[PDB]
Design an enzyme around this catalytic site. Structure first.
Site, PDB file in Angstrom:
ATOM      1  N   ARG A 177      45.929  73.997  18.330  1.00  0.00           N
ATOM      2  CA  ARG A 177      46.795  75.624  18.852  1.00  0.00           C
ATOM      3  C   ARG A 177      47.447  76.265  19.085  1.00  0.00           C
ATOM      4  NH1 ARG A 177      43.517  79.989  21.855  1.00  0.00           N
ATOM      5  NH2 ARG A 177      45.021  80.524  23.124  1.00  0.00           N
ATOM      6  N   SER A 235      39.738  79.079  21.471  1.00  0.00           N
ATOM      7  CA  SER A 235      39.994  78.517  20.476  1.00  0.00           C
ATOM      8  C   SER A 235      40.930  77.274  20.079  1.00  0.00           C
ATOM      9  CB  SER A 235      39.655  79.657  19.380  1.00  0.00           C
ATOM     10  OG  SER A 235      39.642  78.914  18.538  1.00  0.00           O
ATOM     11  N   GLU A 252      37.246  81.317   8.597  1.00  0.00           N
ATOM     12  CA  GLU A 252      38.582  81.004   9.346  1.00  0.00           C
ATOM     13  C   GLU A 252      38.490  79.302  10.548  1.00  0.00           C
ATOM     14  OE1 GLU A 252      41.305  83.467  12.450  1.00  0.00           O
ATOM     15  OE2 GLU A 252      42.313  81.896  11.325  1.00  0.00           O
ATOM     16  N   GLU A 305      37.106  77.664  13.701  1.00  0.00           N
ATOM     17  CA  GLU A 305      37.157  77.036  15.321  1.00  0.00           C
ATOM     18  C   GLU A 305      36.613  76.753  16.128  1.00  0.00           C
ATOM     19  OE1 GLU A 305      37.855  81.080  15.308  1.00  0.00           O
ATOM     20  OE2 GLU A 305      39.257  81.694  16.303  1.00  0.00           O
TER      21      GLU A 305
END
Lengths: 41, 103, 185, 103, 103, 103, 103
Positions: C4, C58, C107, C109
């Site tokens: 991240r 996330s 996405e 996550e």
């Protein structure tokens, strides 16, 4: 009703608080100094 | 036997309860001769000690004294908030009689 | 491990107990009864931040994704880091827990419940001028033996935490119906 | 030798299992003379203590009373939930005789 | 009594304060006969030890000597930052008297 | 000296090695009279204990028994996987006499 | 007087200095009557032990012996990197005399 969003926030928080205890069991245990129980008594 | 620190403290003479609600700021441990003791301080400015095992202690207290210094070290190291302290006020720094912490 | 991008530096992260959800000052902070809700998190967007609101932080499943995501949100930021985090049960695969109601499905996550403790962080790459310094700075407080065995929380533990509102269709169908909290669906 | 706390507890008169299944809420330790004890409270309102080593204590229990006090301190700092308590209900507050935690 | 490491350090002959403000760099422990001791080292260059319990120590000091070796092992294993040390400079390496940590 | 648990166990009549490769599931501690002991269980049903200071024990084991209990509390609290347990298989539950850990 | 594990270790007979620069791999502990000891192994493939306490050990080495097992126990759990070990090569496995950790 709100019971949903209040139940959600609650199952989540209890999931948090228990995980925060696993972590504490890891890190705070480094500081545990054993004692010679036979020494002091 | 009592159920709270406040009830505990009052069966004693020259004792007093201090509300801290804070973590220990400083910790000093000394093995210097005739000054074996722990001194702790809070950002409020207060300073307390766990006194020297002398004669002002009945035998049973000697194992309780050592226990109190273990507690203060692990509390300081972990940053656990101390709630209240029951102290002996006849000496400086105040002596710690009982301690309590809540989660 | 997961990754991240974040504008928060390694000493600010150590100061807070880890990578914290929006509003949460530090990890073991009980003073802020933070709203935790997977669905509300998965749909949110914070400027200058990869989704970190609603009690969840996330993370991505790869470095190029972590970087892609960091380049949209933190583009131009002279400096930001890419955090390598280990898998643990406090992680939930968004797409898996939310199924066809996953807001941003493409996405992928793995959101973390309550934040990420500092001891769970593996290390971090420094990212200058949008370019990844390839030498990973390791975290000495990473508990390798503890996080070595753990895995992400399996979807069957998050369905009840999916956080959909009461009227939500999901609560009335599979697989959510079997774990719906009281007052939902 | 008994295999569970319930079993081990059933071998004593004046004891009773208490299913707590929660983390401790308050920890109070006293080194005050003749009150060298530990008091623990839960959010259900219950209060338990580890009694001061005294007259109705054999000499093998002494090393065991200290052990309990150390266990309670670290169980409290870390938020480990206590499962079952096996207390002696003829003292007030209820006196701790055994403890078990799971997971 | 004194209320800080410096005031305490000042009641003994042949002592000096060392402002560390850093974590222990190396830890050496020995259970070798007649040399049961602890030596610690810092980035700055100094080396300190915790004397072997002989007879420049009164009975309560023996307990205090062990506690300090406990604290130093903990502080090292955890990278806890030490603040100031008070040592007797008439020994080699200098010998530890008190220690303080600040958060 | 034997250089392995498998080897150490191997010379006491009535011993049995147990490959556990799991962590402790429940921890019970009793300070109750004559049951001052620890009992640990594994998910896989197996129960073991650390006996009460039996008269058939020597004094260096006195210190070693208390040590074992210390080890089981911290092993349990830390979720550290145990490798094997050397135990005496003629007591109930099986009595621990040695333990190993790996990695 | 000594200021390093090398300086201290060269003062004995039948002692060698091993450089590990690796964390412990395995940990074995025995309460076994007559084998109250700790055995450790590393990846290098070396097995070291803390010897059992006996009448040859002056009461002073007794306390030092119990400290070492404590250090080895928590060094294992913390996965702390050991730097060098001074050992008595005249017993198998080599007997730990000193230990150093760094950084």
């Amino acid at each position: 009703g709100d019971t949903c969003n209040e139940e959600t926030q609650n199952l989540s928080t209890i999931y948090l608080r228990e995980y925060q205890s696993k972590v504490k069991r890891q890190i705070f245990s480094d500081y545990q100094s054993e004692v010679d129980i036979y020494n002091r008594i | 036997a009592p159920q709270t620190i406040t009830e505990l403290c009052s069966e004693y003479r020259n004792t007093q309860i201090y509300t801290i609600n804070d973590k220990i700021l400083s910790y000093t441990e000394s093995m210097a001769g005739k000054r074996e003791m722990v001194i702790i301080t809070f950002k409020s400015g207060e300073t307390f000690q766990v006194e020297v095992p002398g004669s002002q202690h009945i035998d049973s207290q000697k194992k309780a004294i050592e226990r109190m210094k273990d507690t203060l070290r692990i509390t300081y190291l972990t940053e656990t908030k101390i709630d209240k302290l029951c102290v002996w006020n006849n000496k400086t720094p105040n002596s710690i009689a009982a301690i309590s912490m809540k989660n | 491990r997961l990754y991240r991008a974040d504008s928060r530096p390694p000493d600010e992260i150590k100061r807070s107990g880890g990578l914290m959800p929006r509003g949460h000052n530090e990890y073991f902070d009980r003073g802020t009864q933070m709203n935790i809700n997977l669905y509300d998190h998965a749909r949110g967007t914070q400027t200058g931040f990869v989704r970190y609101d609603d009690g969840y932080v996330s993370t991505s499943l790869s470095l190029r994704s972590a970087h892609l995501a960091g380049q949209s949100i933190l583009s131009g930021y002279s400096t930001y880091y890419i955090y390598v985090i280990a898998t643990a049960p406090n992680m939930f695969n968004k797409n898996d827990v939310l199924g066809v109601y996953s807001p941003h499905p493409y996405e992928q996550e793995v959101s973390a419940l309550g934040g990420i403790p500092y001891s769970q962080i593996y290390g971090w790459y420094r990212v200058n001028f949008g370019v990844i310094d390839e030498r990973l700075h390791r975290n000495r407080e990473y508990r390798d033996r503890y996080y070595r065995n753990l895995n992400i929380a399996p979807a069957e533990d998050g369905y009840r935490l999916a956080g959909f509102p009461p009227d939500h269709q999901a609560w009335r169908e599979e697989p959510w119906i079997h774990h719906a909290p009281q007052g939902c669906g």
